[PDB]
Amino acid sequence: AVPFVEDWDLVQTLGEGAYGEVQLAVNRVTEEAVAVKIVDMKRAVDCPENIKKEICINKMLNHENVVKFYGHRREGNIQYLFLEYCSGGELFDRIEPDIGMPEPDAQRFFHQLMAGVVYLHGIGITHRDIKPENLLLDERDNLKISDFGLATVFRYNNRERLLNKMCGTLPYVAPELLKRREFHAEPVDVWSCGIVLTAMLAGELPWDQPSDSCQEYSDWKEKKTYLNPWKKIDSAPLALLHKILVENPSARITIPDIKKDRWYNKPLK
Numbered sequence: 001a002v003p004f005v006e007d008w009d010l011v012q013t014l015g016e017g018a019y020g021e022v023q024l025a026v027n028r029v030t031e032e033a034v035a036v037k038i039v040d041m042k043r044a045v046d047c048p049e050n051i052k053k054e055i056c057i058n059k060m061l062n063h064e065n066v067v068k069f070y071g072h073r074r075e076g077n078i079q080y081l082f083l084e085y086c087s088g089g090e091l092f093d094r095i096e097p098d099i100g101m102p103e104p105d106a107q108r109f110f111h112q113l114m115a116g117v118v119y120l121h122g123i124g125i126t127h128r129d130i131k132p133e134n135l136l137l138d139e140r141d142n143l144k145i146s147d148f149g150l151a152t153v154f155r156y157n158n159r160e161r162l163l164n165k166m167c168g169t170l171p172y173v174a175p176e177l178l179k180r181r182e183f184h185a186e187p188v189d190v191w192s193c194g195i196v197l198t199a200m201l202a203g204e205l206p207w208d209q210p211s212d213s214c215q216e217y218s219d220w221k222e223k224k225t226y227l228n229p230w231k232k233i234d235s236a237p238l239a240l241l242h243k244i245l246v247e248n249p250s251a252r253i254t255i256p257d258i259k260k261d262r263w264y265n266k267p268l269k
C-alpha cells in the first residue's frame with residue numbers, strides 16, 4: 001500500500017455540542033475529506049452503551065440519502081467516528097427566517113428526506129431526532145440524514161417494538177410522545193418530517209411543542225390556517241401538512257401515501 005495514507009489532518013471544527021465536537025479531516029496523501037466525530041467517553045454509566053450503539057447502527061446504514069460510515073477508532077477516553085463529509089452544510093442554514101426557501105427547493109429536499117427515512121424504516125431503524133440541524137447537504141446539495149446517537153431499532157426479526165423513551169427536540173416531536181406511555185416509531189419520524197417541511201416553507205416553527213396548552217397548536221387543530229404561520233404556505237403543500245400533522249398517530253398519513261400526494265408529485269412547485 002501507499003505510505004502515509006493512514007494520516008488525516010484536522011482542518012476545522014464543523015460542529016459541536018453535548019457529545020463534544022465534529023472536526024473536518026483531510027487525508028495527508030489523497031487529500032480526501034471526511035468528518036470526524038470526537039466523543040469523550042468521560043465517566044462510565046452513560047457512554048459504554050451510547051457511543052457503542054451509534055456505531056452499531058452506523059455499520060448498517062448504506063443509502064445515498066444517509067451519511068455514510070467509514071469506521072471508528074478507540075483511544076483511552078477518546079472515541080473517533082469517521083463519517084461522510086457534506087460540504088453543503090446544514091439544511092437549517094438554507095432556511096431564511098420568517099421566509100423559508102423557494103418551493104421547488106423545499107420539494108426536492110423533502111423528496112430526498114423521504115427517500116432516506118424510507119430506507120431507515122425499511123431496515124427497522126428510527127432516527128428519533130429529525131430536524132434541519134441534522135439534515136446535511138453535500139457538494140451537489142443532496143440531502144443526507146445524520147447523527148444516529150438517538151437512533152434505535154424498532155423492528156427486529158420482523159417484530160415491531162413500541163417505543164416509550166421520550167427523545168427528540170420538542171418543536172419537532174409528535175404529540176403522542178408527550179401524551180402516551182408507548183407509541184409506534186414510524187409515525188413519530190413522519191411528524192418531524194412534517195415540521196421540517198413547515199420550516200422550509202415558512203421559515204418558522206409552528207409551536208414550542210405539540211400540546212393543547214400551547215396556543216398555536218390549539219389553533220392548528222382548529223384549522224385557523226389564515227394569517228398564522230400556514231398563511232405563507234401554498235394550498236397544495238398545506239394540504240399535505242394537514243395530513244402529516246394529525247394528532248392521532250393511527251390516522252396520520254404514512255410514507256407510502258405521502259408519495260401519492262398531489263404536491264409531492266407536482267412538477268416544479
Ligand SMILES: O=C1Nc2cncc(n2)OCCCCCOc2ccc(Cl)cc2N1
Pocket residue numbers: 014015016022035037067083084085086087088089090133134136146147
Ligand atoms: O460534514 C459533516 N458530516 C457529518 C456527518 N455525520 C454527523 C455530523 N457531521 O455531525 C452531526 C450533525 C451536526 C453538526 C453539523 O455538521 C456539519 C456542519 C457543517 C458542515 Cl460543512 C458539515 C457538517 N457535517
